[PDB]
Structures are given as structure tokens and as C-alpha cells.
């Protein structure tokens, strides 16, 4: 059981994914491992990038702000069904990792970046529930409340365990473990508040907005401060800083579904996410500094959520300057998924290099 | 005059109440001291636990949400009068400590945990004023404003001195002194805003909500971070973390009396306090890990304030799920006061062990 | 190019303006330098103190709360025209410093206190635009929007560069550079939101309130914590702590011009600024501890902005206690400008000691 400070000392990268040049590991480097050891949990980010595109292309087809485009609702069918086959494929071959190689699953659970991808399978299930195709689900005002209790049940249980460790004083408190991926532990409170309103429970939705709001302020302020996260915070603007955009984008969508209006509390959350979007994508090294990794799928997710919030802003404020803002953020987000979709098929079948040896879990406990 | 870092180095416990095994002290250990040296200031927490129960049992008898119980208003008489004899008894035998043993009162004033119990005598006086029995005070719309100026006068003067030391840069700023008991310096801004509304001054009440709100956010965020408070922050969930519940509970009651409605600002404060309540009391080691101390009286206080805020939530949201929540939080809080009431009478008169030698004030200034 | 930690190690004072007793510098101490090296950027604070008095004396003459005084609107003429000759005089002789001595301008740009006075020339231009005399500008509902784009254009470009460096992880992030003068990088978001409303753009004004609100909370919380700013944070209450008052004062004026009412969000910002005003000016050492410096002009600025916010509070809450509060804050602020105006004319022409050798820029890069 490896300490949290030992992962920062032995690993290197914005995600702690490479071993340093002077570290010894417990497994061979050049021999090919069995497949269930080379399969990380970070490929639930492929499911986050696809299931968030099914929320967008239903909003583009069913909103009065974008009626002039005449977008067919069959784009939501093919993205919802393809995101549901990938989700049932990744989840089945990760349960087989827990049966045969459970000692490697525990190394990922205490890795300070990969804690937050255990929240990720249950956020994908809530994106597929607030965006069901109307071909499958007609004639309904409310979803059934048992859809909420099965998906937000294990999210809330794992949330009590992690948040209780943050405010206590031993060895995994937030000042020793924080990184930009810690925002993924907060954003499911706002996705779960949208899905609680659409089963008919507006007071449980107000409960989940307030626990997500209080823990967003703690993580946002603590990342501006002097704490032993050294290599996981890059020296200049990296694409990993897109995780800041996800929680104010989902907080403004959630407050609009609860109260029915895009008021001054919902605009303040939307305009914080829009400043962080501009100060990250409006550069020249964001486009020319592209190198593929599977962690790019999870950086697309919070830029698609910000496109959904600017469609709902274009409904409250009508006119041409808000139509043009909503169509230019939802063009950049879908054009990166199409780049990631083709370069994932080329790395899998033409070059065969999606799954190398996962060397970051095999480090030694004690020595440098 | 002992430095703040020397109290953390020489003392041990969640309240800094025991000396470590290698420390020498200025007074004998086994010989019995005079009584006014063995009498701490932390037994103003007995008055906080009793005077907060008089606010609850008047709310249970005078609210339309709990009319079906037919609770007599003579439970408020016997708790208000018993909390007023204990308050005039503790305050008289602490003035005699200041006359004869003022050098020991100064050691408690610079102790980083026991600073906050100098705010405590004036919060008890405001709990007894917002909960007077209607047998004594009938036919009144407003209290007299001089009741506010005598009790909130010395609270506000001592507040300017302490908060000015927090933001400055010398030797007792908040990053060097912070602990969970520092929330007791913030909560009297919200109790004083309830009592300012009930004398007819709604603009002074809005002033006191805003100074309590800004300093709640500073103390809440700074306890998640790397600062030299080492032993006063336990490694797992201790009952000392109930001090987090007190200030969001009183902030939601105060905003309701000012504006007359339990709106979306008042619900956000109530739902933060309810999450911290669940993640602290809904365990198995909260009930089986009971050891008596007089510091338990002060951990009952913020769980009674959270019962008052859920009675006022049951009035805004009518129906059976909010009646059952209000009756289950106000059962847990009154059943712990009844445990503490019997075990305080047994430790005082049957075993005679309430007041041992107060060894934490007699430490040396310099050496380890 | 000198590191940020080397400025804190080699310089001494609340503004880092003196060299320590064991430091060697690159230029002579006793020989008189050329004039463009002895001319700091901190004398844009003379323009901040004068242009903020033109906003006050137009509010005193055009508000229904202060109609009983019959103040002539010719006090706004003589202060607006005098603040506009000083602004065009300081700006012309600083462009000549950039042409001939650009290596000294770069030493001021990386000095951790003097970064924030590069934002200062564009805040002065927005104070002169929201307070134009009605003799020059009659018969207008809205200003032209190109007035906004020329003054807030270079403010917003320099804001993206600095705020992007704060949240990243290399060498000039906020935990390594913070001081009380860092609030001057935040306050132009609220002055620019007042001027965006008065050209007819209320959605750009709501964008600028939200970016200024989120970065106010980061700077306010980070100054309560343990970071290597050592000498720039004085041990007791210095006049440099008046920079805390500026941003909540301008945030309450800005929210009132956008929404047209002084509601519960605007009162919470005003009452935070009023507590910080009382806990800084209501002492005896604030008045008897007066020593002149040119940095005093910039400490007058946030006490004049707090006088403008209490005139607008006296309009929402009518009655004698709010008239007397507005006239006693706007008397203290104008009586210090009159002290600073006479002591600046005496130090310039009678004693000739406004511009000594600016020794803080000539330090060596490496050794102590």
C-alpha cells in the first residue's frame, strides 16, 4: 500500500503516468504483459467524451434558439447507441480485471490522479439518462425515481468516504492529494441534480447543488496555493486545465432546470466558465501543440458541457450575438471529437499502440 | 507570555489539554491545587448546551409544523430557568478567578483553543433573550434595543481585536492559530443578527450577517490546508468536527428572520449543514466511541442549532418527509443532553472527578 | 531578469522600496541620477487619488440624498480638469522613460509590488469617463461604445496574461507573488462594468462582474495564509491595508447600475467594505502615525470609493442615520487629499525631495 507522497516522488507527467529515469519497478519493461494489466481505468474517459456529445446534439435539435438549422434528431440516436455499446464494453472488461488482478486495481485506487476515475462510470450513466432519444421514450413528463437511486446511489456513498478524508487530518487530506483532476469528484453533484429534477424531486436537487457548490469553492481555492503537487501542475497552460470549466458549466444548467429561469445566479456561474474557456482555447499553442493520448478524451468532455450551457444562454438572451457564440463553441467541441475518433482507430488497428505496458502501477514502495 | 507555537509543541490532544511525556511544568502534579486554578473556562460550554435547548423546546411548542404533538410550553420554563442559574453560577466563580489568579486567566487567553471560549459567555446571553418564556414576556412585538447593545457590545469589541490580528502579519495570524474551535468566533454574528431583528433593527442585522458570512468562508477554507496545527486536527472523524455545523445552521435561521422567507439563499446554508451532519453522525463509531469529558457539552450545542433550522424548513416545505426529518434530528440532540446531564452529576458527587489539576496552563516557556 | 524571490530577499519595507543594509547595487548611491531613472511608476497613484475625487463631488451634487447641501457642480469642473492635466503629464514623461531607459521599465514590471501599477493608467481613464461634467456632455442617454473598447481593451489583454500565470505552476503563480497591492489587478473589472452599462451593454457588464468576483475571492483568502511574502505584510495595521476596501466598494456600485436596485447582494458587498473601513480608520495611530510618501496617494483612492458607495446606500435607505454616515466618510476622504495636496507642493518646490535615487531597481541578480 503505497503512500500518496511516494506517487509524486516516483512518477512524472501531468497525469503521473511515466516513471522517472532512476526508479526501479516490480515488473519487466520490455516483455509484453497480460492484457488485463495493460488496461487502465482512464479509458472511462472515452465514455465521458461520447455520452456528453449525445446531450449536445439533442439540445441542438430541440431548442428554439437553434431552430433555423433544422438538425435531424437521428444524430442523437447514433451517438446515444454508440456511447452505450462502448460503456457496456469498457465496464465488462474492467470487472474481469477486478476478478483476476485485484491487486492492480488497488494500486489505481490509491494513485492520486486515478482516484477520480472511479466516479466516472456513474457520471456516464447520468448523461445517458438525461438525453434519451424521444423515439424510445415518448409520452412522459417525469422519469421514474428508481433511475435516480441506482445511478446516484453509489456516487453518493463513495462521495461521503472521500470528502470525509479531505477535511480530516490524516495522510490523504486534500492539501496532500490535490490536482486538476479532483474537479471530477465534484461535477457529479450537478449532473445528479439535473436528473433529480427530471424524476420530480426538486428538493433533492437543491440538496445536491449545495454540496457541489461548497466543495467546488474548496478545490478552486486550494489549487492556487503552495502544496506538494509538483509535476502534476504544469508550468504553462496545458490542456489538463480544462477540468476547471466542467463544474461552473454544469452548475448553471442545473440551477436553470430547478428554478426555470436563467437568472443572476445562473449567469455568474456561466460567465466564470466562459472566461476560463477563452483564457485556454484562444491561443496558438492550443492547436499546434496536439499530441494524442487517451487522456485527451477526458479534456473534451468539459468543453462540450460548456457548449450546452451557451445554448441555454441563447434562449434567455435572444439576438444574433448569442446565436453566434453558441454555434462557435459547439463547433470547436465536435471537431475535436472527430479528430480523436479517427486517431483512436489508427492507434488501435493500424499501428496497434493503444495499450502499452502500464508501468506507473508497478513502482516499488520504499526506495528511490 | 507563551508563544502560540509553543502550545502546539508542548500539549497533546484534540483540545490541547494534556502535557506530553517529556515536558516539565511549573506546578506540582499530585498535590491538590486551590479550587480557582482547577476551574477552566471550557465549562461555559455547559451553558451553551443548556441555553440552546431552551430555543428548541420553544420552537417545538410554538410552530405549526409540530402542532400535532401538543407539547406543553412548561418545558421551556424549566430549561430557561435552569440555564439561567447555571450561567449566573459559572460567571460569578470566574470573576473570582480574575481577582485572585489573573496570571492563570492570561495563560488561557493566549492558549489557541481557549481564546474562543471568551466569546462564549455573550452567546449564551443572546440565546436566553431570543427564547424568553411567554409567561414572563407577553404583549410585545419588539424587545427593547438596549438588550442588544449590552450583550452584542462586548462581543463586537472583542471581535474587532481578534479579526484584525488574523489578517495582519504578526505571530497570531490565522494560519498559525487555526483549529475547529475557531468557528466559535464567527457564530455570534448570526445569533446577534436574530436578536437585532427582534428589537426592530433590520439594517444592523444585515450588517452582522455579512461580516459573519465573509469570515466563515475564510475559516472554512483555511482548515483544508497545510498549517502547523498538528495534534488538534484528528486523523479521523472525531466529535470535535461538529463545530463546522454551527455557523451554516445559524446563518439560515438568521436570513429567514430578516427577509421572512426560507428562500434559495437560506436553503443553500441549511443543506451544507445537513451534509456535514450526515457525514459525522451516520456512523457506528460515533455512538460506541463515547468517553465523557466536559468538552462534550460544547459539541451538543451545534447539533441542537441544526434541529432548530430543520423545524423552520418543515414550515416552508409541508408534508410527511419534512416532519420526519425534523423529529429525528431533535431526538438525537436531546437524548445526548440527557446522557450528559446524568454523567455530569455522577462525576461531580459520586466519584468527585470533574475538576482535576489543570496541567495545561502550567507549562514552561522555553525548553522541551 | 531578477526572480520574484530575490526581490523579497533584497528589499525591505511595506512596498519594497528600500535596500537592506548588506546588499550591493549596480548604480551609485550619492551621485544624482538622470531624471528619467528617478521617476517611478507609483506616481500614477497621484492620478488615482484625484480622478476618484471627481466621481465623489459629482455624486454629492447630483443625488437626492444630499440635496439639502446645495453643492455647486463647478467643483466637478475644477477637479476633472486638474486630474486630466496631471494624467497627460505623468503619461507623457513615462513614455519617454520607455524610449530611453527601457531596461529600468522591465525591472519595475517584474517587481512584485509594481506589477499592479501597470493596470493603474487604464483605471484612471475609466474614472474620468463615468464622471464627465454635464457642462461638456449634455443631452445624452448613453456614451459611445468605442469609449469602452479603447480603455478596457488594454486592461483586458493584460488581465488574461497575469491571471493565466496565477493558476499555472511556474515561478510567478499567486502563492509566490501575493501582497495587498494585488487587489489593484481586480478592481478594474468593476470600474469597467460601470462604464459598460453606461454605453448600453448590460451583458458585457455582467461578464465583468463575474470575473472580478471570482478573482476577488482568490486574493482575499490567499492573504490569510502562509506564503513567502514576509516584509510586505506588516506586523500591525498599516495604511497599506486600505487596498482591501476598494473591490467590495466598487462591486456594490456596479451591481446597482446593472440591476437598478440596491438589493441584498449589493448590501452584502457594501457591509464588508464598511467593516474593513471601521477596523482600520477607527484607531488613534491611524491619525498620529502619518509620514508622507507618494504611496499615500494610492491609499486615499479606496477610501473615496467607499464614500461613493455610502451615498448610494443613503438613497435606498432614507432617514437621518444614513445621511450622517455618508457625510462623515466623505469628509475624512477629502480632508486627506487636502493634506496630501499641500505636502506634495512643499516636498516638490520648497524642499525639493519628491524624486530621490530609486535604489530598489538597481539590485544585483545573484548574491546577498
Numbering used by the authors:
A (entry chain C), B (entry chain A), C (entry chain B): 150 to 517
Paper lines:
We turned to the phosphorylation site mutants which had impaired anion currents and might be stabilized in an inactivated conformation, specifically, the S59A mutant, which has been shown extensively to trim down AtSLAC1 activation and stomatal closure and also has notable reduced currents in the HEK293 cells. In this study, we report the structure of a SLAC1 mutant from Arabidopsis thaliana (AtSLAC1 S59A) in an inactivated state at 2.7 Å resolution as determined by cryo-electron microscopy (cryo-EM) single-particle analysis. In the built atomic model, the N-terminus starts at residue 150, and the C-terminus ends at residue 517. Pore radius analysis of the AtSLAC1 structure reveals that the upper half of the channel is wide open to the periplasmic side of the cell, whereas the lower half is completely sealed. Thus, the AtSLAC1 S59A mutant is in an inactivated, closed state in our determined cryo-EM structure. A large part of the cytosolic domain composed of the N- and C-terminus is clearly identified and forms a plug-like structure which interacts with the transmembrane domain (TMD) and blocks the anion pore, hence inhibiting channel opening. To be noticed, the intracellular surface of the transmembrane domain has a positive electrostatic potential, while the plug has a complementary negative electrostatic potential facing the TMD, suggesting strong electrostatic interactions between the TMD and the plug. E164 in the N-terminus forms a hydrogen bond with Y448 in TM9, and D166 in the N-terminus forms an ionic interaction with R263 in TM3. Besides, R263 also interacts with D507 in the C-terminus. Although the Y448A single mutation retained the activated anion currents, the S59A/Y448A double mutation did not exhibit apparent anion currents. Taken together, breaking the interactions between the intracellular plug and TMs can trigger AtSLAC1 activation even in the absence of the key site phosphorylation, and the cytosolic plug observed in the AtSLAC1 S59A structure, especially the N-terminal tail, may serve as a pore blocker prior to phosphoactivation.
Slow anion channel 1 (SLAC1), an S-type (slow) anion channel of the SLAC/SLAH family which is preferentially expressed in guard cells, has been identified to be mainly responsible for the stress-induced anion efflux and thus playing a pivotal role mediating stomatal closure. Similar to HiTehA and BdSLAC1, AtSLAC1 forms a homotrimer that is tightly packed in the transmembrane domain. Each monomer contains ten transmembrane segments (TMs) that are arranged in two pentagonal layers, with TM1/3/5/7/9 in the inner layer and TM2/4/6/8/10 in the outer layer. Though assembled into a trimeric structure, each subunit of AtSLAC1 functions as an independent anion pore.
